[model samples]
Target: SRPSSDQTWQPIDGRVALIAPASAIATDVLEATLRQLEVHGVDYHLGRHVEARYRYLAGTVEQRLEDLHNAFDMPDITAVWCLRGGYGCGQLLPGLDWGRLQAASPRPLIGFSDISVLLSAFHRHGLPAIHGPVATGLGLSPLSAPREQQERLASLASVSRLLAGIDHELPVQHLGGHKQRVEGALIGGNLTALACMAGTLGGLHAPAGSILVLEDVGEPYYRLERSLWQLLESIDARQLGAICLGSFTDCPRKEVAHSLERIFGEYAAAIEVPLYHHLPSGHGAQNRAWPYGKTAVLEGNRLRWG
Candidate 1:
């Protein structure tokens, strides 16, 4: 991987807020994730309500946003990262103080999938963020690729490199999809979540010059296409630079006769922009953290951050 020249890399060094108001990742898992952050030697503070739970959400929208508000208010905190990404992120979007956060410091924020709603919010406020593994992601056992999580973790675990913004280009694997190169502000997440947040004031209002990335889980091929089409309709097609797609693990096609490649390829062909898939993140144990909201280009089927 080659590094980019114009990127200003920042660390998620501030107080880490655990805002998963929906779904239960278990107390042990939360502690273990915190331990992993500690093992990486990064300083973090628990939000005021990490232990608070409402079904799966960390708390009510007000509670979640309050913790976030506290995090941004902290003078020592450099950035904010989600403890996990599940269901409650969308519900909290309307309640966030994006204007204030953007004015405060515009520090780095990291998340993907269900957390995509927040990404869209940050983007509207002119803040840059990362589309990568959540804190709960660090707790997953890397039985299949032990070093895979570690390598990705190294990107976040090592404070020096994360803050210095050293130039590095992660190769984009072809993964049996379309062969195309793209460059734009990479933006995407869980297909359903992206759609759910595609129209509101704080929702995604994708513009030109943005390369939309996408993925999902448990959805059939048709449903995936529906979401893809929904996304395609949400953003402007003419101004797009290109597309970069990550893994869509566990998503089922209609039948054995149909395949993931066929499903993604069908939609990729319809879009006018270049489309490439196989980013090693989202719903996979080997998921690596990728920066979002910055100018990233895919060269020779590889997405090199620039």
Candidate 2:
């Protein structure tokens, strides 16, 4: 059942319902996330299909959709957290009940990578969501044991802060333009997922006067360029007030740094919107939580959310 509009936002301290709406997560990885959530004193519930596997996806379309809808409709659940991101979320978009979601009090849906499709869809419905680390990311070992522990703790803290609705400034770089300030409703997440939505029924659109945030992983420079181009072709740049680029991790090397800078710089120039980069949300170790469908202010080298 949906919470009444007059009801205040639920205390961030309530239970988090973890659902596998994308790829199946490893048992060890899921356990780590459970431990961390417990350490933070956040109670959690797993989805009925959280561990189901159908090749790369956690489950079939109906199964994943059932878990998602169940989470959204559970009155006791304060949030919905995806187990991991890989592929398949785009398949669920056409069948989603947007009106049902909109009728309910917003329960922040949190995840990145392929989950970006869901985040963007919720944003389109004027619901607040988060572009943040998923369960597998909780135990990511980008370094040795000690360093890995620190990273996990840091990631846990970041997620907790977001869940608590704490706002802070995020450092970013001005890729090309003179430092300037812009504010708008923030929209966007993974580049490939967002690009795939172009020209599809119920696809995402950058609201008039919006700031777009984008990131991705494991694609070559050419594909990256192609994806961005597809999205730009569908979105009117003039309608966008600004754009923020997050970390693009593990793209194949073909003079990677130079090509990304050149490609993104060209897009920035063509779009004529202030383009900012390295906002610290993506597949990288620093994939901090970024709010969608909320007013965000970008200025100098920092981004702040309300």
Candidate 3:
């Protein structure tokens, strides 16, 4: 038995089925996010286990799975949004009932970081998913200049726009790769998450002619390089139509001779595909939402998608 559900990729209709599939979220975060949703005119139905922490995880697999499963079953829910992405999401993969999920009307699932595993699964199943903020940061304040906060909120608001099918383009740094426009379903999320999922039931790999996006936070160059190597090998990098790199955020140089750019450049050169940087997504202050499994165009240091 399942809750009734409706089509994938439709506009969000300003209602959300909010659940926490990864780390535990503080109560203040929940309240602030709810307020933000309210200001945006978004109504939300919180998943039953969103606030429960069975030990370190937000909830045990059973509790988390029930909420996730119930999200798709709710007829009134226009979209499913993750509350945060610290860890524990990949644990639900083996328990996922794809048939039941697929039976529900297609609705977008949005979040990044640890939520990447779920995004990848949604992609393979032909479901709507997005690599976007887990919707908590919006409730917090940035210590940076007011200019930064302005752009940050704008980027976060892009989620609502994209949900309404509002199209926009982001200008990137144009690191390297094919110079022509390349189109493919945008896939990928946190580099660590994607790499961790490489060999499992939800193994991460870019389909032929797909854009593979990647980002991460706090790791030093060495760790990032290792994850990058594994991910490229796991995904058979050459098959991808393009590679879009989002912000590395606090990933450090740590006295290494190679800057982050060089490290990424070498990898792109080895793979020989379209490469772009400064995607304004990931753990950085400006994490914009972009749809996974949706067609995106990469060209001339710019990426465009709905």
Candidate 4:
């Protein structure tokens, strides 16, 4: 159900639930996230069967899917925060009860990275969710997000309010590309996850006039190129209004012949659309909150939301 007059706006009100699908988070990470919860004064429930380990995943696919289905099914759970994004979400998706989730109560399910699969699937059902910080990443790292990132995440406003262009302004001159004003819906996430969705039911493709924001971690320059090529091979890049390149945190350490800038910048230029880079919304110290599935505009060097 939507928020009623008896409700109030907050990061996420009501009881929340946490789910870690892949990779075990160190105890310290969980403790840190708990501390943040205390600071924010939000009540949350732990995911059932989240701690079990099975190879690369947090648990057997059946177990993980069970936990996810349960989380969405819970009547009191207001938000489902993913503990981390690893490589195992795809394994669980085919078995997940997407229909059940659609029938469940509506709430903000916030996360990113490997969780990209969920975002695409949720969007297919007309749900717009946040693609900002993940629980493990935010909870494990002590470094605070940039000031702007903090502001966006803490707003505690309804997703519709956030998307309605209320008090919104964008800037020009992004990471690179010819700065031009363009308007569209916002969609995109971890590059690898998106490329992998190609030809699948909930792939990277979105409606026309959608601005695509992409980022990745620990991927070499060529690998990034490969992912982009796969993405292009799967869908038409020309349909997108613009592309925003958020933080690619591990770009500097990658072993590539041409510099990272040469590879990414060159490919971006070839796309012939406005491209913004150096955005701090990735697996970096300045990781901040950014909304996906919202109407946003890019002009010159600034990205404005409405």
lDDT of each: 0.65, 0.76, 0.82, 0.67
Residues 135-176 of candidate 2 have per-residue lDDT tens digits of 666655445676544544565456657667754557787887
User: Of the candidates numbered 3 and 4, which has the greater lDDT value?
Assistant: 3
- Would you estimate the TM-scores of all the predictions? 0.85, 0.90, 0.92, 0.82
Decide which is better by TM-score, 1 or 3: 3
Model 2, residue pairs in steric clash: none
- TM-score between candidate 3 and the true structure: 0.92
lDDT of 1: 0.65
Query: Which residue runs of candidate 2 sit more than 4 Å off their true CA positions?
Result: 1-11, 139-142, 145-149, 256-258
**TM-score of predicted structure 4:** 0.82
lDDT, model 2, position 234 = 85
Better of 1 and 2 by lDDT: 2
Candidate 4 residue 299 C-alpha distance from true site, Å: 2.2
**Candidate ordering by TM-score (highest first):** 3, 2, 1, 4
Index of the highest-TM-score prediction? 3
lDDT tens string, model 1, 1-306?
422222223444554544553344667877887887777666787777776777767777777778777767777766577877777777766677766686666567777768777877777677777777676766655546755545555544422344346534555655333355566777776778887766666457466777677767777777777877777777775467665676787875546576767666666656656666776556754355666667677778466666
**Residues 178-284, candidate 3, lDDT per residue (tens digit)?**
68889888989899988888778877747898988889999989999999999898877898898888888887677999988888888988989768888878886
Rate residue 157 of model 3 by lDDT. Answer: 72
Rank by lDDT (best first) = 3, 2, 4, 1
